[PDB]
């Protein structure tokens, strides 16, 4: 077994949460160990706002998400063709420029199924309402 962060903890520590469809592996980040990928948008879950003003889609849909295997994640892994929910920040600067204009993946892929998605909702919803 692989411990993972409670899913309150996770919506706490991701700012933007989204679902999509990995198109191309892309290039590897020998520095992390760590590779990216084209993304083929569907819906955003939460921050859609911020993806709006901190990155340059290309054809109107589609990222690059990065740090794919990271070991500190336990579900880091895929291939083209797959569909998940993406937990994910956008790059700091010091980040840049290997991984600018790009999002990174800050917790475990989860599947897409109707009750991830419920899930991710409410936990989403209710960390709101404290507002």
């Given at each position: 077994n692989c411990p993972e962060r409670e899913l309150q903890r996770r919506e706490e520590e991701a700012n933007v949460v989204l679902t999509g469809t990995v198109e191309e592996i892309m290039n590897v980040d020998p520095v992390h160990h760590t590779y990216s990928c084209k993304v083929r948008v569907?819906?955003?879950?939460?921050?859609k706002d911020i993806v709006t003003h901190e990155i340059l889609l290309d054809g109107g849909n589609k990222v690059v998400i990065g740090g794919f295997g990271?070991?500190?994640?336990?579900?880091n892994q895929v291939s083209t063709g797959d569909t998940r929910i993406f937990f994910v920040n956008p790059a700091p600067?010091?980040?840049?420029?290997?991984?600018?204009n790009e999002l990174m993946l800050n917790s475990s892929l989860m599947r897409i199924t109707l009750r991830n998605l419920e899930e991710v909702e409410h936990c989403v919803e209710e960390h709101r309402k404290l507002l």
């Open positions: 569907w819906r955003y879950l939460k921050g990271d070991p500190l994640i336990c579900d600067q010091y980040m840049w420029p290997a991984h600018r």
